[PDB]
Design a protein. Structure first.
Lengths: 242, 110, 124, 93, 123
RNA sequence: ACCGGCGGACGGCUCAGUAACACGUCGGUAACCUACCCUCGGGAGGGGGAUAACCCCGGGAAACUGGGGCUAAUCCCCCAUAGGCCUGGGGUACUGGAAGGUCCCCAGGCCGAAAGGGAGCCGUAAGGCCCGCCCGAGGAUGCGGCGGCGGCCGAUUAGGUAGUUGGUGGGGUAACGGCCCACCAAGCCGAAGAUCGGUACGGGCCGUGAGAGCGGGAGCCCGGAGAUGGACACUGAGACACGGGUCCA
């Protein structure tokens, strides 16, 4: 019987968010633990091999990652198992190429190209707030990163707000709030790859999160959960969103 | 008066137990059901019953089943048999007690 | 072994057959049996996941507390009453909730020597 | 003859990637040396840096697919391109 | 024919000698760490080691191996063979950390069966 | 070849048991753990000690195994402070529907960190670049435990269960709990079939049929269980560990 932690992942069981042929082979890259969840990330190796066609063989891909030619969020990463997850910015300076990771309407991830000037801004959902010794306020984002700030600035932030993060130097730029009428891009669910405006927030007790209702560009109304709602602008999207 | 997060008024009695969700350290998280008290003999204990109809795919009729659940009866409310009560999942408490009464929707006499 | 696991009997009564062997993550450990002595003797124990925990096998001093919240480190003379068992008070065993006699007087233990490794109590 | 369907540029690897088709009506599938020495002409490439990976001979077709590399320096191909294909092209004994 | 190996801390040099006859009876009943003047042991150590040695140079029994090859553990009383579970100590060479193995090792006391004896010089 | 960094708790193989919260679904931890991975705030001092390899000799048929010489680190060890834990008192902010927790002050006690580096460029050098260490708070991977419902046959097996069922107070555990223990009570299950036996890993499915349905779980994937049978430890983040250990048959 099994006796502890896995180190493998068969191709057939891979998450449904990966545009990977499944019956060609049997063994895939098990992502190591990292910023984003299994359900909202892919190894960088597959990004290099499939989504960009730069490497045909994983050994060569790993070699190019060893050269450290790749800038994710303004940081080189050699780990060919890095979970590169949702709303990350991939930058290749050798090619001057910049994409943002975003899901599909179907529920799969694609690299939407973005302008270079946008490549330095990363919006982060405020997952939760906590008090650390010294009465300091630490905010845990959707991607697992953490930011420390003063007690006085605690009310500048609330959970479910979006912080436009300057990833190259880790500088907080703007805080989009969660209030009626914001512009929101969905992350998961049947309403994936939708962008609309908020009319109502459904306060649900008994273990069930807040169901926001989103009004699309064409005026059609639908519903999704709080955590799937990701604000990107007060009235228009501050980033190129398909 | 402390909030349980369930739309129901709090019991008037304030008990000193550590196991009253209104008057103790324990929490609530999981489903909420409703049912009837069938037995109360063991101390601070209750067996809640629940009837429901189940569908037979081959016979297209309905089977009425009776399901029992053990739960803890805090003294503040003091549930008795014949009473319609509300039940919530709770921390494991005994060998079998894994649910707790939160209120008495309607006692026996009514 | 010390196995803190399934009861062999169902709630109704039908005896339960085992289908697998015991698991080291599921076994427990011996009782500390903290006693009154002239010095503090303690054992540190490596635990599940590499944690640690210290265990008083003999206790000499106690941290009594006034209702105000001021603490006094003192000695422990003898245990008055052990509600957990009648054999324990007879054998100077020290357990949470026990009524103890120190130089100050009567105290009630509000800490577990088995897991904490120190004994705290409230003056009565 | 040889007709190029595609030439792309791996800038992270400093290499040209060439997809092409070979017309060989009624005549056996060509040897590697000839296709290399004849493709070397019309893109102005150094023979050593250029490597051809696969020439797929289709069943019941006079067109065979072909796919090849073109590096920019001696060191990069040794560092990256594994020894076997160098042996197939003869670039290593 | 006890094979006694005498080792010098001062020089880091060790030499083998043989013992038979009454001198053997002298070393029976002794224990590891026991001290004995070389005079009762009757070796011209000054000749073997080719150096001057004080007449009060003594020999201390330290170890050896049985006939079959079971050393005497200083921590085990008696001259017999007993099986012991060794996590460490003489006669046990572990490889993997925390590994434990059961072996049969002689107890400290010297016996006639023992064929190898080890002694260290002392001045 | 050595201590030492890692791994050999994954993956490979099989279906005896097991009629079970083993399992399918949904919840479920505020009652867990967590090495390598990510983020953020802080820290990385002083001092001491060890023995392999190698050289001198040794046994036994072996397996295996002795003593003396000296030797290394991020090895071991003591202290420095943080820090970990527990309690009393007093307050205030965060999380959250919820509870209480977390935040701070005071008071009492035990426990209680680190590691530098091979090379190269500049710098006399230090230092910087690169890799590596530790404390604290999160995340993430994997796992622990609680639950409603679903899913066999027998009545020529009808009464069953004593830590049995609950309460008080503790113990041990990573963790809640009869898991255990001392006491206090008389429960709890069964004709909408317990108890007992026969039978049997559960699912995604597959064969057949116009379909209702009937029958089956071998081949892949997911979950569960095992290493001839039993039973018990050490190392460890993870084990009772196919290619590690101990006894019995």
């Amino acid at each position: 019987a099994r006796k502890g932690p896995k180190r493998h992942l068969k191709r057939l069981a891979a998450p449904t968010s990966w545009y990977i042929e499944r019956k060609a082979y049997k063994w895939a890259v098990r992502p190591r633990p990292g910023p984003h969840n299994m359900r909202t990330s892919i190894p960088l190796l597959y990004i290099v091999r499939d989504y960009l066609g730069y490497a045909k063989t994983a050994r060569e891909a790993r070699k190019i990652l060893n050269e450290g030619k790749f800038l994710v969020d303004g940081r080189v990463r050699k780990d060919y198992k890095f979970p590169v997850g949702i709303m990350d910015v991939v930058s290749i300076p050798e090619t001057g190429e910049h994409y943002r990771v975003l899901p599909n309407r179907i529920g799969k991830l694609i690299l939407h190209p973005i302008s270079e000037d946008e490549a330095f801004i990363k919006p982060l959902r405020i997952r939760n707030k906590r008090m650390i010794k010294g009465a300091r306020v630490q905010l845990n984002f959707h991607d697992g990163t953490n930011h420390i700030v003063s007690i006085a600035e605690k009310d500048n932030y609330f959970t479910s707000y979006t912080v436009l993060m300057k990833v190259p130097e880790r500088e907080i730029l703007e805080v989009l709030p969660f209030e009626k009428g914001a512009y929101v891009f969905v992350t998961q669910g049947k309403n994936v790859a939708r962008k609309g405006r908020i009319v109502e927030i459904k306060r649900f007790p008994m273990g069930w999160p807040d169901v926001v209702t989103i009004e699309d560009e064409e005026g059609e109304l639908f519903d999704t959960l709080k955590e799937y709602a990701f604000v990107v602008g007060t009235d228009k999207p501050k980033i190129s969103l398909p | 008066m402390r909030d349980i997060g369930l739309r129901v008024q709090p019991p008037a009695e304030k008990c000193d137990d550590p196991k009253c969700p209104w008057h103790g350290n324990l929490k609530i998280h999981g489903r909420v059901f409703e049912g009837i008290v069938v037995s109360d003999k063991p101390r601070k204990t209750v067996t809640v019953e629940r009837q429901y109809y189940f569908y037979l795919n081959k016979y297209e009729r309905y089977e009425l089943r009776r399901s029992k659940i053990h739960a803890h009866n805090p003294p503040c409310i003091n549930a008795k048999v014949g009473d319609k009560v509300l039940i919530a999942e709770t921390r494991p408490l005994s060998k079998t007690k894994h649910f707790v009464v939160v209120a008495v929707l309607e006692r026996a006499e009514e | 072994a010390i196995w803190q696991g399934r009861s062999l009997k169902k709630p109704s009564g039908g005896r339960i057959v085992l289908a697998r062997k015991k698991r080291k993550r599921e076994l427990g450990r011996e009782p500390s049996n903290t006693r009154v002595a002239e010095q503090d003797k303690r054992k540190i124990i490596r635990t599940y996941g590499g944690n640690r925990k210290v265990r008083l096998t003999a206790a000499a001093y106690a941290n009594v507390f006034d209702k105000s919240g001021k603490g006094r480190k003192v000695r422990i003379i003898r245990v008055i009453e052990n509600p957990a068992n009648r054999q324990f008070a007879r054998r100077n065993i020290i357990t949470k909730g026990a009524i103890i006699e120190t130089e100050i007087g009567k105290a009630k233990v509000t800490s577990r020597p088995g897991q904490d490794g120190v004994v705290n109590a409230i003056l009565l | 003859e040889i007709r190029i369907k595609e030439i792309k540029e791996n800038k992270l690897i400093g290499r040209k990637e060439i997809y092409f088709e070979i017309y060989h009506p009624g005549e056996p599938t060509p040897s590697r040396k000839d296709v290399k020495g004849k493709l070397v002409a019309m893109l102005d490439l150094n023979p050593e840096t250029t490597v051809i990976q696969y020439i797929r001979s289709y069943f019941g077709s006079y067109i065979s697919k072909g796919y090849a590399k073109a590096y920019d320096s001696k060191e990069r191909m040794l560092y990256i391109e594994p020894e076997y294909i160098l042996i197939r092209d003869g670039l290593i004994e | 024919t006890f094979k006694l190996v005498i080792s010098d801390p001062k020089s880091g040099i060790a030499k083998q000698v043989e013992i038979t006859g009454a001198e053997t009876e002298k070393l029976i009943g002794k224990r590891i760490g026991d001290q004995i003047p070389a005079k009762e042991l009757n070796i011209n150590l000054n000749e073997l080691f080719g150096k001057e040695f004080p007449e009060d140079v003594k020999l201390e029994i330290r170890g050896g191996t049985d006939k079959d090859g079971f050393p005497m553990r200083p921590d085990i009383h008696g001259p017999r063979r007993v099986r012991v579970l060794l996590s460490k100590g003489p006669g046990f060479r572990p490889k993997e950390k925390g590994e434990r193995r059961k072996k049969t090792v002689r107890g400290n006391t010297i016996s006639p069966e023992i064929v190898q004896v080890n002694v260290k010089l002392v001045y």
